[PDB]
Design a protein around this nucleic acid. Structure first.
Lengths: 116, 43, 136, 75, 50, 177
RNA sequence: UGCCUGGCGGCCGUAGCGCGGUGGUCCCACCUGACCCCAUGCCGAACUCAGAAGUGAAACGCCGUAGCGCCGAUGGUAGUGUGGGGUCUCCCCAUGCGAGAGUAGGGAACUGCCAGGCAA
RNA sequence: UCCUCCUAAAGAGUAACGGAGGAGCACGAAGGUUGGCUAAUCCUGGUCGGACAUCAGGAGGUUAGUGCAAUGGCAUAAGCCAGCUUGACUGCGAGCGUGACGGCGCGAGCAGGUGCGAAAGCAGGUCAUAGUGAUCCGGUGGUUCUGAAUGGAAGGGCCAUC
RNA sequence: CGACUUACCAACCCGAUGCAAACUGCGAAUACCGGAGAAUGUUAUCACGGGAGACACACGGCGGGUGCUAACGUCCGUC
């Protein structure tokens, strides 16, 4: 199962970040509408979220679910986090290879202020 | 598809004795001569 | 001569015979021999009792043995000093607690059943009583 | 041909639930991981659990496998 | 105990060396690990020797 | 690829009408094919493995991989991790052209032909079979090879049972004697 | 506020399996192609990129069903600390603690944060 | 002498010429990190091929595996595969466990300089528990520390090691 | 090349019954460790210093190994 394999892949990282006790930037990727979220160390609340599923961010990019979409979401999370106040975060692959859209989102985020 | 590890997969035209001709991509080589095919055979 | 096959260990501790019997009810036949006393039965005693009943019933009915030795017992050879390791295994015994059902039987009249069990109990070292299958 | 034995390794729980410990103190000595490290608890190379911070030690059961965890709260 | 002990000598002029073991029967070639030399306080190549 | 269009043209409709499914994807469809060659005699002469792999590359469109023993068994004098066979799995587009070569030029050229078997089903919808000799495929000239070893074929589909798998294969004008 | 959907958790079998039904407005999945990014100890299988035709088949979510797993009393029993007694290789009395298995029964979940669509 | 289980009486420890077995290693990778993967046993179809080689599907959920006997542990895998590598590093070390002692074990963290990863991070050998021998005497390399009138040297000391 | 029966051997499973120091999907009483509190006890506790003796134990109860659930036997745990 794709989901079961993915959860098994990301379990070690999630546990490592959980015991470390640090805010983590978690990204969920699908064939469309790449998501992104910021989670408190306790893991119970979401500091801020962004994605291409809402019209506020989906009204510019031609198509959601590409490199451009990842950069927009990656950038979008940036100023939101900077405005909120949190600066340092830990990136979570969530079992997605850090190659394409995931890398583009992270690259946009780190260059936008969320260094990690 | 890995490179320079697979045999050449060029197209080649083959015809049999009963007048049926078809194009197939394979590793047969330069030319091929057949006598029977799916049809025109006592299957 | 009941005996296990390829037991895990050749020797085992003496242990104790405290407690109370578990298989206290008739489960297979209609009549059974219940153990009143406490002790151990060797393989030879079980065989002797079994032969006594089979002859008594004249190979009529069914016989169930509800006890297995599954416990080796050692014995030092004569003129041997204490120590120098555990003794060699000699015979196998089954620990019996009060209420244990030794043998079960079915397919014979109650009258003939009583004498058959009485003959067997005469060749056992523990007080025994006759019981009948109960309804629930 | 018997008569051989090994010196006892004095394993077991050294600090029990609800008693304060200092950082670096050994909590549990074990061969495997009968108890898993929780919060402010580190695991040694020999699966020894030691306190990474000062506080009260507590035991709990967590996870889908109901495996036992040892944590420390700064109290 | 076929495995025998060797000495790893720093490529630098310093006389510092490490000591280890290896099996000459299976891996007869020299050992060229890159280790830390405290006399010069740098990581340098260490060569196998007696 | 030509039969893939043929499959997409009316075979899907033929499957649709006969089973009158609710949807279109319910119809069984092939996803991959697998070629096996359990040579077994690697112990006697491991050198022949390379050429045994080579011919499979002649029939197939890609390089085979050599499989290793799952475990060591004393009855066969094989140790764990020892190559004792090769296989090939082909899917996507290349499977279709190979399927042509099997169904058009290969089956008719069977020595002492009697008819393709119809009971060779695993019980779930997957078909398997074997061949005596390589010359059935045109890629053997009878002079560059001197071995009698054969090979095995296996086509797997999304069928939930044998009845639709057999029906789907029948749509591909299989002999099934 | 409600029916829904996705993510991150709490909690961990009353939460898990089996059978039947139900879902495509969004979301999700399958799905087309892959020259380029990326990968196959061979394969667009898996991973990754460019897409959205088609579909709810499979998977996933929800509902129903006890067919299983699971939870589970009260009472009794076994054992047992302390103090006494006996026909003392085992038991009994006073007091304290009190199982395991089984039985009646329960049971096919609950809950926090964020984001999106519909009705409000 | 050392290691594992039981005896051992639910903390630790606990004897017998009591009941069972092992060790005097191995590995420059079988170590470090990054990425990925998940067995045994059965059922059905299929050339040699046959109960037992390899392929496909299904039940199964770890009965597999874990370099070596046993116990405990291991899906975040400690199990299996691949890339890059030498942290199997130097000086320390709060605080603990264990011993009559000699001693043995665990260890966050600090300084220096490295490897893997985009990064958070991990790495002071190996899933852990056996694979080991005090002191004396002497050998090898470094270090003006000392060097008995002075300058050297011999010989000692210190450090690494046999 | 289809295929069939059985008075006869029997695997794996299902239902019932047992056993185990080196079996555990369960699990006490006691004991042990830590914290708070009252009363009581000539500090009964710990650390350091001076001086010792002792390191042949025996029986009884309870939990065991060994022996024959023999020994005023032998070897351990606790009183």
């Amino acid at each position: 199962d794709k989901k079961s394999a993915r959860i098994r892949r990301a379990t070690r990282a999630r546990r490592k970040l959980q015991e470390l006790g640090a805010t983590r930037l978690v990204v969920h990727r699908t064939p469309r509408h790449i998501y992104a979220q910021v989670i408190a160390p306790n893991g119970s609340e979401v500091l801020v979220a962004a994605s291409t599923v809402e019209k506020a961010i989906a009204e510019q990019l031609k198509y959601t679910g590409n490199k451009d979409a990842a950069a927009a979401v990656g950038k979008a999370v940036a100023e939101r986090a900077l405005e909120k106040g949190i600066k340092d975060v830990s990136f979570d692959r969530s079992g997605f290879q850090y190659h394409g859209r995931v890398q583009a989102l992270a690259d946009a985020a780190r260059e936008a202020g969320l260094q990690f | 598809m890995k490179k320079d590890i697979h045999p050449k997969y060029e197209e080649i035209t083959a015809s049999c004795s009963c007048g049926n001709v078809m194009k197939i991509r394979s590793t047969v080589g330069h030319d091929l001569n057949l006598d029977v095919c799916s049809k025109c055979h006592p299957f | 001569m009941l005996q296990p096959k390829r037991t895990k260990f050749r020797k085992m501790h003496k242990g104790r015979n405290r407690g109370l019997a578990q298989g206290t009810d008739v489960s297979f036949g209609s009549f059974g021999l219940k153990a009143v006393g406490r002790g151990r039965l060797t393989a030879r005693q079980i065989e002797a009792a079994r032969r006594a009943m089979t002859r008594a019933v004249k190979r009529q009915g069914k016989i169930w043995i509800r006890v297995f030795p599954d416990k080796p017992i050692t014995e030092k050879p004569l003129a041997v000093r204490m120590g120098k390791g555990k003794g060699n295994v000699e015979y196998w015994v089954a620990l019996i607690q009060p209420g244990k059902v030794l043998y079960e039987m079915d397919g014979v009249p109650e009258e003939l059943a009583r004498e058959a069990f009485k003959l067997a109990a005469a060749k056992l070292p523990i007080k025994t009583t006759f019981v009948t299958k109960t309804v629930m | 041909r018997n008569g051989r034995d090994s010196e006892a390794k004095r394993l077991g729980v050294k600090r029990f639930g609800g008693e304060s410990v200092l950082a670096g103190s050994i909590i549990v000595r074990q061969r495997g991981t009968k108890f898993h490290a929780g919060a402010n608890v580190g695991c040694g190379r020999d699966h020894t659990l030691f306190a990474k911070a000062d506080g009260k030690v507590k035991f709990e059961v967590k996870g889908p496998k109901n495996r036992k965890f040892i944590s420390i709260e700064a109290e | 105990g076929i495995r025998e002990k060797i000495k790893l000598v720093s490529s630098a002029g310093t006389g510092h060396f490490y000591t280890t073991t290896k099996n000459k029967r299976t891996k007869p070639e020299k050992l060229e690990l890159k280790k830390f030399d405290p006399v010069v306080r740098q990581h340098v190549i260490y060569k196998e020797a007696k | 690829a030509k039969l893939h269009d043929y499959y997409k043209d009316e075979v899907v409709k033929k499957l649709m009408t006969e089973f009158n499914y609710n949807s279109v994807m319910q119809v069984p469809r092939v996803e991959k094919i697998t070629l096996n060659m359990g040579v077994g005699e690697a112990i006697a002469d491991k050198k022949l493995l390379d050429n045994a792999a080579a011919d499979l590359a002649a029939i197939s469109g890609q390089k085979p991989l050599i499989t290793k023993a799952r475990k060591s068994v004393a009855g066969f004098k094989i140790r764990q991790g020892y190559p004792i066979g090769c296989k090939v799995t082909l899917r996507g587009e290349r499977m279709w052209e190979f399927f042509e070569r099997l169904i058009t030029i290969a089956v008719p050229r069977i020595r002492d032909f009697r008819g393709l078997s119809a009971k060779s089903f695993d019980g779930r919808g997957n078909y398997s079979m074997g061949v005596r000799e390589q010359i059935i495929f045109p890629e053997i000239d009878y002079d560059k090879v001197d071995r009698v070893r054969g090979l095995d074929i296996t086509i797997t589909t999304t069928a939930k049972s044998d009845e639709e798998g057999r029906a789907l294969l029948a749509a591909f004008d299989f002999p099934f004697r």
